[PDB]
Amino acid sequence: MLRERTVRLQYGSRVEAVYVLGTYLWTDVYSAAPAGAQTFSLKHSEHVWVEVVRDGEAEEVATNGKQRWLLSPSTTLRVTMSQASTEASSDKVTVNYYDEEGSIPIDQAGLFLTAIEISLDVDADRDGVVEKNNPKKASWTWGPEGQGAILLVNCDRETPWLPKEDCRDEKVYSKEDLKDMSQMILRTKGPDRLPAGYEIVLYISMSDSDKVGVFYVENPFFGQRYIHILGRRKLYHVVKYTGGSAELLFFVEGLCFPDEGFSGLVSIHVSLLEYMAQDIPLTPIFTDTVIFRIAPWIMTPNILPPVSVFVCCMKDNYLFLKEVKNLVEKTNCELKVCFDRWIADEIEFGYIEAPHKGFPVVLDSPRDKDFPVKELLGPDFGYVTREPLFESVTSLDSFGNLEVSPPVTVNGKTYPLGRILIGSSFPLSGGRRMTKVVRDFLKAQQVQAPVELYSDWLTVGHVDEFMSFVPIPGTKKFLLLMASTSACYKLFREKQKDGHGEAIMFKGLGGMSSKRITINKILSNESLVQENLYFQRCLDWNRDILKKELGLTEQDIIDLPALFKMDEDHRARAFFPNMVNMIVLDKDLGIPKPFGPQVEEECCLEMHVRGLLEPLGLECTFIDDISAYHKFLGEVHCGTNVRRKPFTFKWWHMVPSRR
Amino acid sequence: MLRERTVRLQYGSRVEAVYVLGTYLWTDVYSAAPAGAQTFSLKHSEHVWVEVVRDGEAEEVATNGKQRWLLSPSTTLRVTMSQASTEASSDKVTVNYYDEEGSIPIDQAGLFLTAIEISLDVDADRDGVVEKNNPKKASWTWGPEGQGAILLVNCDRETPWLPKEDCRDEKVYSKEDLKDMSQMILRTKGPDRLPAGYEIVLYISMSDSDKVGVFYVENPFFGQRYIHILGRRKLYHVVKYTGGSAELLFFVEGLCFPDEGFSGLVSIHVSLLEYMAQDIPLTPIFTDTVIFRIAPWIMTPNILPPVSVFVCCMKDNYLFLKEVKNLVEKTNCELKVCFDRWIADEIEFGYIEAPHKGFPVVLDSPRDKDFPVKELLGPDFGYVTREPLFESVTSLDSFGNLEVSPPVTVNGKTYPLGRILIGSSFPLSGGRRMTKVVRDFLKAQQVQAPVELYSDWLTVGHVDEFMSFVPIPGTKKFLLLMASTSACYKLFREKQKDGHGEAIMFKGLGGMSSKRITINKILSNESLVQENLYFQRCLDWNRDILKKELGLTEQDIIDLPALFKMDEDHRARAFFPNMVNMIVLDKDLGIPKPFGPQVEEECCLEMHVRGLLEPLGLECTFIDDISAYHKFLGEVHCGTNVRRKPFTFKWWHMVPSRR
Ligand SMILES: [Ca+2]
Ligand SMILES: [Ca+2]
Ligand SMILES: [Ca+2]
Ligand SMILES: [Ca+2]
Ligand SMILES: [Ca+2]
Ligand SMILES: [Ca+2]
Ligand SMILES: [Ca+2]
Ligand SMILES: [Ca+2]
Ligand SMILES: [Ca+2]
Ligand SMILES: [Ca+2]
């Protein structure tokens, strides 16, 4: 017994009421007394506990006492029951009223009770099973000691016959769908039927009706069916009561990820309703509430174990395919090929998790691209997208512009899932920026606390053009890799001094041959030197943001030589392939083949990169995606996306800061 | 020195840079080395601290040393300055490079520095004065130990010549306006001018531009003027630098209260910008940020000291005016009269507070009412309103439907400012509810954590028809007063038994006389008894919510007799005036005169109410607003609104729960 409820005795009459377990009644006996009545006595049944409360002081009374008390407005009853009524129950309290002359009652008022248990239960303690009436089920708190139930957006697709994600409709087809859903049990105990005038109703708000759906599983003659009882255009469901000790099992799906204007928290209610009369609304005698938080979309840094390597290229790029295959064979990853840069630009593999279930889910980049990537939608492979209404899409909406750091600690605050990284332009610049709809979505997931970098000095404008992360083998540490033009100039000047100035660039690319690009020709180009000094300033501005926002020092960073050429917008495009954008499969790195100056018949860029990485136990494989095209103009011709295992750290164990 | 910044030496050249105090530089000397260089040495000036960092291990170096170190990419410099450059400064670091043959330098690279202090300061520690560089000025935290700067919505009006609140424009006229504003100081130290290519810029986001305005005070020849430098349609302002130790004083106004979609937090930034070249955006070398939270609109419970009593009635309601005047004379309050129920329905007196300033502010009820209450707008008397776009206004939007509890503790959680109370209908009812725009606004203030009650069983539909709060004189406690029909029936039945059944109701109201309403006539009306039993159920449902949400027991509640009659919508209107809606001026209560049955030439309702309240030290005055109309049909003919002192508890010392 916790909540006090008001049930008044009625003058001269009998009051019948449902008593919901976990509450108790305060009972006015004074208003029902006939005028002139002096004192009262009371009788009560075996399973009803009665106290007489005078001015706050309470006294327990026997089932049949003859004891009398003075009638006063400040003398009331407190009525309690610990167990549900059966058909063998008579649960009652009877009050007798006496005037001052004579010991025979002049009147009587009584209270007839039917006790029932009503509890809407969910797995609040997050172990995957639904506990009985968790007192914390009506709130949601973060952290290891945190509590409250978790809900997955059911964004995958169980059967291929439908083009759309499961959550797009109000229907369930396969029982396998239920495995993606959170269980909710309405537990009751009581007699064979509810007393006349009562019904039990499940309901949700209009606002939450596009955030959830709730199904009930029926097992009629011709086989299992799934009834949608709450969700889009269904705000309430009248429950069919069955007596004795009973449980109704419901399955809940999320329809929507957290977003701008939506915290991710939703509510479901059950009420016992009392019929008053026609034209009068039913009265909510008792209400129980459970809360769900919808699980966030979470990205995967390069430090996490690789599962599948997705690759796209034209069918004839052979060296690329052979070299990627060899790379993947060194690992336990599976290779998937589509016959070309989209897989990098249009998709980001994320994941969702709840205590009972989790699956990978694809974020699909905004269309400019007239069509979705939706052919990856399948069983336990989910899909989500955001499209702008007004705002126009630019190159910064491509997911080459979307990355995530490993876990970091910054100013004493840990980010166990790392931090999302997105390239942007300076605030006063008037430059490009990723669309608000996508930015709002990433921020709304909250657990990856996104950081904006400066990518808009690049023609394409993506963060993965200038930076990446790699593990340090045999440790729990990692390194930030940064593109560096000054590293390239230093190396080339060294090679020139060594007598190598005539060493030629892009050997084996026949479409570059007539250009005859040598170290000498590069170093003597004055405007190019100035362009790249400026680009190093851009890289260093990013370096400072990353050290600041990721809690990094110079010990955590390695510089890879890079070179750019300025276009007419004053933005950088790669002069030779960017080696920093690499396939990271734990200790094995697929690195884009640079095609740098040959010294003693080895690329000096390759040899320099090996000398930096190999002492760490990182094994380097250079991958050639460009020879099939016979030249390099600054554009990458293939794409790869690695799908990884989720973090072992549970997101709900994080404690993000107030918003 | 806290933040590390990257400044690279440039090959063969000299690099000039501004050094902002509170940062330090990491300096690459390796990239600037000529090819073939083996070792390096360095010189530096008196006010520049230089460390040689090899692989993380740092060593301080003398101003002129001859010491040489091996050139390595992992050997860098750490450069620090503790004081701003003057005109007498030469701040520099020079690096000499040596090859393996000979001790004369083969080249030199150098760093020329100008150190400046730049700090954007606000009163983060909330004492009313602007401290120097509070490290917490860039966040906002709740509570006694909390920190970060507070901003008032400047919603009052300094001069009458303009019809609108001060914040509606971009202009400031009177210097008195500045007193409503938060101070923000840009503090700097440095030489006579910034080095070539730099400028300092204040800025805000597009989003915050309708939330704030920022003025600078100039004192030219012809007198003081106020320049709007940031706000609506001004997102940035280029600052005029003056050398030496300088401070620029700015004044910040809030334009908007917290609301749906607006947390109340805003940002203002200062950046040092570096010019690169034409067509290239300027680079933000350094940025400092301050945060403001806009103060919430807060209501006043009846326990707070009364300041002014606002009253509206027709000019000839004399008994009302005389009796209200007498009541107010017992107190130190001032009476204000307008010559009629609006003042209760259309306005709610709230207040705002910041450490430097606070003033009362009126919430104006949504129009159905074709015109605002805006004639209360004046100096230090502010105004705010919310109007629906789509949703239609009903009687539940009237501010008789808007109240606030005294401070309460509920389940261990304290609500030091009390909790806002608003009447509504049951969730499945399809009944009336206050408009979303107003509800969203009240919820968004956060510090009064609003609760919805059930008012929609009443024809008018206001919470102040059935409940109120009064202090308990000579204590810190209070009572909830509840209308009770059962209390009325009990009293009338007692009077009937006493021989008083023929005692007549509404004596002295000539328009009621032909009805000849007596106790007998009331008690024998069967359908009326049933109507009022139902209304008591409605009252008791509210009673339970209040005890639950306010942490109240039966000891905290007193029932006042009331009676209603049902209309054709099954809603209640007062049968005789509702005594619970009363003027509370501390120990003195103006109570609506009930016009109840006369027994021994005293109203039995008046005598019953005195017997309940007077033993507590509450002094009762019955006020007659209806005799001037000769009858009572259930409508109240006058209105009163009491403006009170604010709580002494500062809202920013509260810690509300996560949202
Ligand atoms: Ca559980
Ligand atoms: Ca479905
Ligand atoms: Ca599914
Ligand atoms: Ca599934
Ligand atoms: Ca990506
Ligand atoms: Ca201060
Ligand atoms: Ca103004
Ligand atoms: Ca003002
Ligand atoms: Ca003012
Ligand atoms: Ca009010």
DSSP for B492-550? HHHHIIIIITTPBSSTT-TTTGGG--BHHHHHT-HHHHHHHHHHHHHHHHHHHHHHHHH
The residue written with tokens 């300092």 in the block is B200
CATH architecture, range B122-294: Sandwich (2.60)
A612: enclosing H helix or E strand = helix A604-613
Centre a 10 Å sphere on the Cβ of residue B614 and count the other Cβ atoms it contains. Answer: 11
Q: B485-495 and B526-550 helices cross at what angle (nearest 10)?
A: 130
Q: Considering only CB atoms, which chain B residues are within 8 Å of A553?
A: 4, 56
CB under 5 Å of ion ligand 7: residues: B 166, 169
* CA nearest to A155, candidates A296, A303, A271, A269: A296
Q: Are the beta carbons of A164 and A157 closer than 8 angstroms?
A: yes
Calculate how close chain A gets to B321, using CA atoms only, in Å.
Answer: 36
Query: In angstroms, rounded to a whole number, what is the distance separating the alpha carbons of residues B69 and B76?
Result: 10
Q: Are the beta carbons of A317 and A341 closer than 8 angstroms?
A: no
Q: For residue B281, give the DSSP letter.
A: P
Pairing mode, if any, of strands B149-151 and B236-239? unpaired
Q: Which ligand is nearest to the CA of B129?
A: 6
Chain centroid to Cα B473, Å, comes to: 30
A223: left (phi over 0), alpha (psi -120 to 50) or beta: left
- What are A622's strand-pairing partners? A591
What spacing in Å lies between the alpha carbon of A300 and ligand 5's midpoint? 10
User: Where in chain B is CATH 3.75.10.10?
Assistant: 295-659
Query: In angstroms, rounded to a whole number, what is the distance separating the alpha carbons of residues B270 and A36?
Result: 81
C-alpha torsion sign, points B441, B444, B447, B450: positive
Q: What secondary structure does DSSP assign to A94-105, as a single string? A: EEEEE-SS-SS-
Q: Are the beta carbons of A216 and A250 closer than 8 angstroms?
A: yes
Identify which of B280, B431, B494 has the shortest CB distance to residue A35. Answer: B494
Cα distances (Å, whole numbers) of residue A570 to A394, A397, A459: 17, 20, 8
Q: Which ligand is nearest to the CA of A179?
A: 4
| Residue among A270, A537, A539, A557 with most chain B CBs within 10 A, to mutate | A537
Centre a 10 Å sphere on the Cβ of residue A128 and count the other Cβ atoms it contains. Answer: 11
Both structure tokens of A135: 């007192």
Query: In angstroms, rounded to a whole number, what is the distance separating the alpha carbons of residues B630 and A5?
Result: 41
- What are A642's strand-pairing partners? A309
Pairing mode, if any, of strands B198-203 and B265-274? antiparallel
Calculate how close chain B gets to A641, using CA atoms only, in Å.
Answer: 32
User: Where in chain B is CATH 2.60.40.1700?
Assistant: 122-294
Q: Is A562 helix (H, G, I), strand (E, B) or coil?
A: coil
Task: Report, as residue numbers or ranges, the catalytic residues of B.
Answer: 638
| Residue among A142, A267, A544, A613 with most chain B CBs within 10 A, to mutate | A544
The residue written with tokens 């509920």 in the block is B410
CATH code for the domain defined by A295-659: 3.75.10.10
Query: In angstroms, rounded to a whole number, what is the distance separating the alpha carbons of residues B503 and B484?
Result: 21
Query: In angstroms, rounded to a whole number, what is the distance separating the alpha carbons of residues B477 and B407?
Result: 10
Give φ, ψ of B639 to 5 degrees.
-145, 155
Question: Alpha helices, DSSP H only, in A356-514?
Answer: 436-445, 463-466, 485-495
Query: In angstroms, rounded to a whole number, what is the distance separating the alpha carbons of residues A454 and A422?
Result: 8
Centre a 10 Å sphere on the Cβ of residue A462 and count the other Cβ atoms it contains. Answer: 24
* CA nearest to A365, candidates A651, A656, A639, A659: A639
Amino acid (1-letter code) at residue B337: V
Pairing mode, if any, of strands A602-603 and A598-599? antiparallel
What spacing in Å lies between the alpha carbon of A172 and ligand 3's midpoint? 9
Q: Are the beta carbons of B56 and A556 closer than 8 angstroms?
A: no
CB under 5 Å of ion ligand 2: residues: A 166, 169
Q: Considering only CB atoms, which chain B residues are within 8 Å of A659?
A: 263, 659
Chain centroid to Cα A92, Å, comes to: 50
- Name the maximum alpha-carbon separation found in chain B: 129
Query: In angstroms, rounded to a whole number, what is the distance separating the alpha carbons of residues B647 and B409?
Result: 16
Q: A485-495 and A526-550 helices cross at what angle (nearest 10)?
A: 130
Q: For residue A631, give the DSSP letter.
A: -
Q: Are the beta carbons of A230 and A236 closer than 8 angstroms?
A: yes
Query: In angstroms, rounded to a whole number, what is the distance separating the alpha carbons of residues B651 and A266?
Result: 29
Query: In angstroms, rounded to a whole number, what is the distance separating the alpha carbons of residues A215 and A237?
Result: 11
Give φ, ψ of B110 to 5 degrees.
-145, 160
Helices (H) and strands (E) in chain A, counts: 7, 41
- Number of Cβ pairs closer than 8 Å across A and B? 143
**Binary contact (B3, A534; C-beta < 8 A):** no
Judge residue B409's burial from the number of C-beta atoms within 10 Å of its C-beta, 0-12 exposed, 13-18 middle, 19 or more buried: exposed
Question: Using alpha carbons only, what angle is made at residue A607 by residues A602 and A609, rounded to the nearest 5 degrees?
Answer: 145
**Binary contact (A281, B428; C-beta < 8 A):** yes
Q: Are the beta carbons of B603 and B597 closer than 8 angstroms?
A: yes
Query: In angstroms, rounded to a whole number, what is the distance separating the alpha carbons of residues B307 and A219?
Result: 69
Pairing mode, if any, of strands A602-603 and A639-644? unpaired
Q: Are the beta carbons of A453 and A546 closer than 8 angstroms?
A: yes
C-alpha torsion sign, points B241, B242, B245, B250: negative
Kindly identify which residue of chain B lies nearest to residue A658, measuring between CA atoms. Answer: B658
What spacing in Å lies between the alpha carbon of B640 and ligand 10's midpoint? 10
> Which residues, 6 or more positions from A602, have their beta carbon under 8 angstroms from its beta carbon?
none
Q: Is B67 helix (H, G, I), strand (E, B) or coil?
A: coil
* CA nearest to B344, candidates B636, B591, B633, B593: B636
Q: Where are the beta strands (DSSP E) in A193-339?
A: 198-203, 212-218, 225-230, 236-239, 244-254, 265-274, 283-294, 298-299, 306-312, 334-338
What size, in residues, is chain A?
A: 659
Query: In angstroms, rounded to a whole number, what is the distance separating the alpha carbons of residues B631 and A279?
Result: 31
A312 catalytic? Reply is no
Q: Are the beta carbons of A474 and A617 closer than 8 angstroms?
A: yes
The residue written with tokens 């495009």 in the block is A573
Both structure tokens of A615: 């002492």
Technique behind the model: X-ray
Question: Alpha helices, DSSP H only, in B72-139?
Answer: none
Please provide the distance, in angstroms rounded to a whole number, between the alpha carbons at the two ends of chain B: 36
Identify which of B3, B431, B490 has the shortest CB distance to residue A548. Answer: B3
Cα distances (Å, whole numbers) of residue A5 to A28, A57, B537, B544, B547: 11, 18, 11, 6, 9
Pairing mode, if any, of strands A408-410 and A413-415? antiparallel
Centre a 10 Å sphere on the Cβ of residue A184 and count the other Cβ atoms it contains. Answer: 24
Q: Are the beta carbons of B489 and A11 closer than 8 angstroms?
A: yes
Is A60 annotated as contributing to ligand binding?
no
Helices (H) and strands (E) in chain B, counts: 7, 41
Pairing mode, if any, of strands B334-338 and B382-385? unpaired
| Residue among B7, B136, B285, B426 with most chain A CBs within 10 A, to mutate | B426
Cα distances (Å, whole numbers) of residue B349 to A67, A615, B380, B404, B659: 53, 73, 13, 11, 26
Q: Considering only CB atoms, which chain B residues are within 8 Å of A4?
A: 544, 547-548, 553
Q: Considering only CB atoms, which chain A residues are within 8 Å of B540?
A: 6, 8
Cα distances (Å, whole numbers) of residue B1 to A179, A353, B80, B285: 55, 42, 7, 16
Kindly identify which residue of chain B lies nearest to residue A571, measuring between CA atoms. Answer: B280
Query: In angstroms, rounded to a whole number, what is the distance separating the alpha carbons of residues B56 and A499?
Result: 34
The residue written with tokens 């629906």 in the block is B388
Query: In angstroms, rounded to a whole number, what is the distance separating the alpha carbons of residues B177 and B158?
Result: 6
Q: A604-613 and A485-495 helices cross at what angle (nearest 10)?
A: 120
Judge residue B598's burial from the number of C-beta atoms within 10 Å of its C-beta, 0-12 exposed, 13-18 middle, 19 or more buried: middle
Q: Is A419 helix (H, G, I), strand (E, B) or coil?
A: coil
Query: In angstroms, rounded to a whole number, what is the distance separating the alpha carbons of residues A132 and A187?
Result: 8
Question: Using alpha carbons only, what angle is made at residue B527 by residues B521 and B533, rounded to the nearest 5 degrees?
Answer: 100
Is A121 annotated as contributing to ligand binding?
no
**Binary contact (B73, A543; C-beta < 8 A):** no
Identify residues after which chain A is interrupted (C–N over 2.5 A).
339, 368
Query: In angstroms, rounded to a whole number, what is the distance separating the alpha carbons of residues A462 and A574?
Result: 12
* CA nearest to B122, candidates B36, B251, B1: B251
Q: For residue B365, give the DSSP letter.
A: P
**Binary contact (A534, B276; C-beta < 8 A):** yes
C-alpha torsion sign, points B160, B165, B169, B175: positive
Give φ, ψ of A607 to 5 degrees.
-65, -35
User: Where in chain B is CATH 2.60.40.1860?
Assistant: 1-121
| Residue among A439, A490, A530, A608 with most chain B CBs within 10 A, to mutate | A490
**Binary contact (B35, A497; C-beta < 8 A):** yes
Is B55 annotated as contributing to ligand binding?
no
Q: Considering only CB atoms, which chain A residues are within 8 Å of B493?
A: 11, 34-35
Both structure tokens of A31: 């208003």
Question: Using alpha carbons only, what angle is made at residue B98 by residues B93 and B101, rounded to the nearest 5 degrees?
Answer: 165
CATH architecture, range B1-121: Sandwich (2.60)
Is A588 annotated as contributing to ligand binding?
no
Query: In angstroms, rounded to a whole number, what is the distance separating the alpha carbons of residues B502 and B523?
Result: 11
Q: What is the resolution of this structure in A?
A: 2.1
Query: In angstroms, rounded to a whole number, what is the distance separating the alpha carbons of residues A262 and A264?
Result: 6
**Binary contact (B281, A428; C-beta < 8 A):** yes
The residue written with tokens 């790869």 in the block is A640
Centre a 10 Å sphere on the Cβ of residue A252 and count the other Cβ atoms it contains. Answer: 23
Calculate how close chain B gets to A593, using CA atoms only, in Å.
Answer: 24
C-alpha torsion sign, points A256, A257, A262, A263: positive
Is B348 annotated as contributing to ligand binding?
yes
Is B125 annotated as contributing to ligand binding?
yes
Is B129 annotated as contributing to ligand binding?
yes
